Structures are given as structure tokens and as C-alpha cells.
Amino acid sequence: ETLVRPKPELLKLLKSVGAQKDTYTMKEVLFYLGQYIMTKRLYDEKQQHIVYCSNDLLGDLFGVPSFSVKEHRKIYTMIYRNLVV
Numbered sequence: 001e002t003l004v005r006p007k008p009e010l011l012k013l014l015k016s017v018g019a020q021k022d023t024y025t026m027k028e029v030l031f032y033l034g035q036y037i038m039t040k041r042l043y044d045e046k047q048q049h050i051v052y053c054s055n056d057l058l059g060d061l062f063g064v065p066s067f068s069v070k071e072h073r074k075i076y077t078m079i080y081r082n083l084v085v
């Protein structure tokens with residue numbers, strides 16, 4: 001009840017990087033989302049603060065083509081839209 005419950009499309013995201021649970025602290029979520037971005041190589045060599053998720057499950061979930069890591073509010077909005085209420 002400290003924790004938060006992923007909607008199952010994001011929870012399938014988390015397991016494609018080795019996650020075992022189905023509830024999580026925010027930290028776990030942020031950390032797994034980062035696995036993803038760095039494993040699936042979703043970024044520009046030119047400007048590395050932009051993540052491009054255009055043709056990818058991540059983009060699906062967040063409903064965007066791309067977004068900047070410097071933009072937290074906007075990130076948490078995207079994450080929460082995927083949290084079981």
C-alpha cells in the first residue's frame with residue numbers, strides 16, 4: 001500500500017527487463033523504464049536527452065512519439081495514466 005500497480009501493458013513492459021512483481025515503488029518503475037530505454041536503445045546519438053519511442057510499446061503506453069528526460073511532470077503524467085487506480 002506504499003506501492004503502485006501497473007496496468008497490464010506497462011507491467012508486461014517491466015517483465016521484458018526482468019521484473020518479478022506486479023506492484024512496485026516508484027523507484028523500481030523508474031529504474032525498469034530506464035532498463036528499457038537503455039536496452040532497447042531508444043535514443044539519439046545527437047541529443048541524448050530525447051528518447052524516441054515512436055514505433056515501440058513504450059510510445060504506445062505513454063501515447064507519444066518522443067519526450068525529453070528533463071520533463072518530469074510530463075513523465076509522471078505518462079506513468080500514472082498507466083497505474084491501476
Ligand SMILES: CC(C)C1=C(C(=O)N2CCC[C@H]2C(=O)N(C)C)SC2=N[C@@](C)(c3ccc(Cl)cc3)[C@@H](c3ccc(Cl)cc3)N21
Pocket residue numbers: 030031033034035037038043048049050051069070071072073075076
Ligand atoms: C534511461 C535512464 C536510466 C536515465 C537517463 C539516461 O541515462 N539516458 C537518457 C537516454 C540516453 C541516456 C543518456 O546518455 N543521458 C545521461 C541523458 S537520464 C535519466 N534521468 C532519469 C533518472 C529520470 C528519472 C525520473 C524522471 Cl521523472 C525523469 C528522469 C532516468 C529516466 C528514468 C525513466 C524515464 Cl521514463 C526516463 C528517464 N534517466
